[PDB]
Design a protein around this ligand. Structure first.
Ligand SMILES: NC(=O)c1ccc[n+]([C@@H]2O[C@H](COP(=O)([O-])OP(=O)(O)OC[C@H]3O[C@@H](n4cnc5c(N)ncnc54)[C@H](O)[C@@H]3O)[C@@H](O)[C@H]2O)c1
Ligand SMILES: NC(=O)c1ccc[n+]([C@@H]2O[C@H](COP(=O)([O-])OP(=O)(O)OC[C@H]3O[C@@H](n4cnc5c(N)ncnc54)[C@H](O)[C@@H]3O)[C@@H](O)[C@H]2O)c1
Ligand SMILES: NC(=O)c1ccc[n+]([C@@H]2O[C@H](COP(=O)([O-])OP(=O)(O)OC[C@H]3O[C@@H](n4cnc5c(N)ncnc54)[C@H](O)[C@@H]3O)[C@@H](O)[C@H]2O)c1
Ligand SMILES: NC(=O)c1ccc[n+]([C@@H]2O[C@H](COP(=O)([O-])OP(=O)(O)OC[C@H]3O[C@@H](n4cnc5c(N)ncnc54)[C@H](O)[C@@H]3O)[C@@H](O)[C@H]2O)c1
Ligand SMILES: O=C(O)/C=C\C(=O)O
Ligand SMILES: O=C(O)/C=C\C(=O)O
Ligand SMILES: O=C(O)/C=C\C(=O)O
Ligand SMILES: O=C(O)/C=C\C(=O)O
Lengths: 308, 308, 308, 308
């Protein structure tokens, strides 16, 4: 069976194990720094297997040696933000955690595809590629799928249609400056502008950008995890099953959109080889303006990373 | 449990029972004119239930009384075409069969939504609405979902991407003049023109229109059934689960697109109430030209129907 | 669509929403006494639908009015235990909570099947029946499905066989006195005793009885929720899809096994009518002695309850 | 992705492709000696993927080269029986077909587990092992899973319980002498004898033994395929996902139950290695007498085979 290691057994990591187990994609290793916690969660989820019918071994651990030879590594060890904070506010604590986790797991699973989740996503993904030395296409960040998911949800709600018929591309850093693209948003191939008034659609773009913060202010003591885990799981699936999904993920740019040497949210073809292709869309001036402002927020992020 | 009656237990009908059983949407009644056949197929499929785990009763019958009080009626009793024939060539034999089936089932399930499949689809759907006297929104034809499915498949194959990320609208009668709409075709919200060259995309539109015939010439003694049944099943699901799907189905027009008093392939919101809304897309001159030529092929079809 | 209200949006409650939403069994209402928390979890789970493909409306609230007319009501508002505690230690606090919850929810959904989860399970279920005034067969407690799930998992692990081919019955109160039944445990119809040595099987039985405490000790800050939620979801599913599941649940007894006026873990037929029949197994002397010790324990909690 | 080749794109073969594709277990190659037929069915099934959401490449062919390097090989190229015939009557025709198929497919996929379906099952499986020269545990026949499926269905119908809670073992050749085992039949761990009266259970046993003939008589032009394909698919799944399923299949014996040098229906552990272990049940005298009569029958087909 395929092997999937999830570094960090908190809300996003455990919930990610849940979505993955149900899919019976492969055995799962939940690792954490805290003792007992990952063992408890992994056993609890394993105990649900007779009810649901999936045959996947779910083991909790505190030993990186158990993650050896993984096909995919999911990193959800980062600390989450609390109300009043930005994802960028976590860069110091999470740069340390990220370096620590990657330096230990990466060497034990050289052929694995690493999927980062820790925030600030784009920066942490750059860090992981640096600490691991893995080919850039095998080191990616989860952000786009989640952001576009919130976007697609608000659209289905607004238009009163099935979430299964809504598609939408969204680019840029995983932050306030993310770029949801109405012009690249459709319902069964039909532009969403045909279902939603511009003003209403503007409010949706805005809510999308502030989506994470909306949850934080509701939960009060935590950050979102259901949609995040689903997004992460879908990416793991795309790789394990070589589905050739077209989705927005934080990938390493070498000139696309006039951007070089950065991990940025762009549309890609995700498969068994990780990012198998980065798509270069014909964005217009307004779109590029928004993208550039996002590429700038990200670079700012990388410069902070540099001084840590 | 919900009740679904499938009139006509041949390739499309039995295969439709298969897709539906697996979904555990409701009990299924397979009816046929031939003795034994529907009983055999329904028992054979019922015997698969312990293997797959679905709890749905699947019963074969030759008695319309067993279909009473159905929530949905699927009509797949029509005779299929053989190589060298057009779907229109079946209108005489199938008008008789259709009238016969509808006159017997309709009265026994007054609150049911009827989903026609018999060809020529658009005409047979008009006939069913006439013979049943059911509100027009509760009498619809399956065609668009299937046609667009073939279309979406050729696109995924061409672009080398996941069928799960391809969306595409297709309108008009279910025949040679159907209108696949490249401009309303997307991959994760991105126009398909960004993935396929125009000439290649033209060949896909063509293959789509002749899709059914392609299968017929391969099977030699029969017509397609896997995709057709899947399409039909998805529509049954949309109704039973009130999913508010946005899809192309043969619906009754009263002015939309400048067309009145005809069943025609148009984009609709399909839910518990059947066609809950017909969408009027801003098609351009070239698109309208193709649509009008299709609306003309359909009317021709209705005029033939009139003389039967 | 079917309507399901979950009272108490904590670990088990929210995870139940997750299992349920994935099955697309109906709209879910997550209620809690804490503002924001339910809304956040509901929205977050809702935002995952575009990724998973399920059309379910998940709404969070602090207002019981929103639970009105539910098909099923899940009660997971009880305080969980911490290491060193017995489920019974929660009887006073959870008796108040359970009473508060039932008295407000029951009246608004008189036709709903109430599924209790709050601990101590057996006593709380009895209190619900008493407070709701509902028909006994429509007020049941989840416990046996979870307990048997743990038992079946240990069996699968020990035997090295798919968890899909393992069935196991277990009865009694949801506590230490719990009674798993090796004699009524099979793998593809074959007695487990044929797969697991007596000493080892005895260990599995003991681990099953303390399986909950095991998790509480590993987590240290809370109790299990993945399996508990999967079990609670499977019961909801049994009711809504009228599957006639043969499973152990806390049902009201009137003489079965020689026990009267008590909610106790017993094998039942679960369907749209709730507990449709209480099975009466021919238990030997060994099993009955154990069962009676368990009954004695449950009775004790009731004496405590009736004196609160 | 995993590769699965299905030799013989008829009723069972194509339906297996359908069950398989829906599980998204790997690419499927449908081969047949008749031109066009496999290509048509493959394309039609492929065109359903956009509707169902599965990314599986289904290709039809008349060239064995396309089956090279398959993980699993399903053989469904045998001629089916018509009413009034016994499966054994097909031995001469199907011996030639089976020999032709194996000798061409085996060499191209030396590491594949071969799953036979052609009738008479037991004898054809033996012929495959002989022609392929493969390790006995990697050449198995489907039969018991189907037979037990029918048996389990009848049990569920009679008892009025979910087919999910019914397990039942059954052994012997795939023919009239077939041996279902009431003693090794349970519902959530409880003996079926507790649910079904002896006379009725005896009727279910007889119906199971003739369940195939029953379908052939109802269809009149062919034999069963929905359950047969579901069973064959569950075995393929067991192998590819290494689930360690406990199920009855035609495995090579070397003394178990006192039988040597014969493929016979016996309970095994099915995993990535094919038959990983042959379980040896403690059958009583009644059961053994029946088992021996069955063995006598299978042996007779082998004598016929060895003289072809
Ligand atoms: N990219 C996205 O779209 C997205 C979505 C949600 C959350 N996130 C981010 O993901 C991270 C996880 O969020 P969460 O809510 O699950 O948090 P959490 O606090 O619940 O879980 C993090 C887990 O990491 C563990 N941990 C800490 N240091 C570790 C180390 N060195 N090694 C292994 N494990 C370690 C903790 O003990 C904890 O169990 C946060 O940084 C959050 O902001 C990103
Ligand atoms: N709308 C689409 O997209 C679409 C797709 C595929 C097929 N079709 C059409 O659907 C029909 C069925 O195709 P098929 O391949 O399943 O055919 P088929 O010949 O296999 O099956 C038709 C079944 O109808 C039964 N039947 C005949 N008269 C009947 C009556 N009066 N009452 C009840 N049952 C009766 C037959 O005995 C037969 O079992 C054809 O007309 C075909 O052209 C439409
Ligand atoms: N029966 C079983 O098999 C089983 C399995 C697991 C847990 N449990 C029990 O289930 C309960 C819930 O466990 P948990 O881990 O989810 O706990 P939790 O503390 O995470 O969640 C309980 C939720 O109830 C809410 N709540 C409290 N009073 C309320 C009121 N009056 N109305 C509405 N909501 C209210 C809280 O605010 C909280 O969000 C506990 O009593 C636990 O012991 C039983
Ligand atoms: N073992 C079981 O439990 C079980 C269950 C059902 C059917 N069966 C048996 O399975 C076989 C298939 O049944 P069916 O109903 O699908 O039959 P079918 O006639 O529909 O299909 C058989 C297919 O084999 C093809 N074929 C013939 N010779 C071939 C060759 N040399 N190479 C490649 N393909 C070739 C045919 O052209 C045909 O498409 C029969 O022998 C039947 O008795 C066994
Ligand atoms: O808001 C957060 O911190 C996490 C969710 C997200 O990244 O969107
Ligand atoms: O070609 C046919 O007759 C049927 C399939 C379809 O309607 O596309
Ligand atoms: O032990 C607990 O409190 C919860 C899990 C269970 O009841 O099994
Ligand atoms: O009876 C047949 O020929 C096929 C079905 C089976 O073997 O059970």
């Amino acid at each position: 069976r395929k092997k999937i290691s999830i570094i960090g057994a908190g809300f996003v990591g455990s919930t990610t194990a849940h979505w993955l187990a149900a899919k019976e994609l492969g055995d799962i290793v939940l690792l954490d720094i805290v003792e007992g916690v990952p063992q408890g969660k992994a056993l609890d989820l394993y105990e649900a297997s007779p009810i649901e019918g999936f045959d996947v071994r779910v083991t909790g651990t505190n030993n990186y040696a158990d993650t050896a030879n993984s096909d995919v590594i999911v990193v959800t060890s980062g600390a989450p933000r609390k109300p009043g904070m930005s994802r960028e506010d976590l860069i110091k604590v999470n740069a340390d955690i990220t370096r620590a986790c990657i330096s230990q797991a990466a060497p034990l699973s050289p052929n694995a595809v690493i999927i980062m989740v820790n925030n600030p996503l784009d920066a942490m993904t750059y860090l992981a590629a640096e600490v691991s030395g893995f080919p850039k296409e095998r080191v990616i960040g989860q952000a786009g799928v989640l952001d576009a998911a919130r976007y697609r949800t608000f659209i289905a709600m607004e238009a009163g249609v099935s979430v299964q018929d809504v598609q939408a591309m969204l680019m840029g850093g995983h932050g306030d400056e993310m770029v949801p693209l109405p012009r690249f948003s459709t319902i069964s191939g039909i532009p969403v502008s045909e279902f939603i008034a511009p003003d209403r659609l503007a409010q949706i773009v805005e809510r999308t950008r502030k989506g994470g913060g909306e949850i934080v202010n509701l939960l009060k003591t935590g950050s979102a995890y259901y949609a995040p885990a689903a997004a992460t799981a879908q990416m793991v699936e795309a790789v394990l099953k070589d589905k050739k999904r077209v989705m927005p993920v934080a990938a390493y740019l070498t000139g696309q959109y006039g951007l070089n040497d950065i991990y940025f949210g762009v549309p890609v073809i995700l498969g068994a080889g990780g990012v198998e292709k980065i798509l270069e869309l014909p964005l217009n001036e307004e779109e590029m303006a928004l993208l550039n402002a996002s590429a700038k927020a990200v670079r700012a992020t990388l410069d902070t990373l540099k001084s840590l």
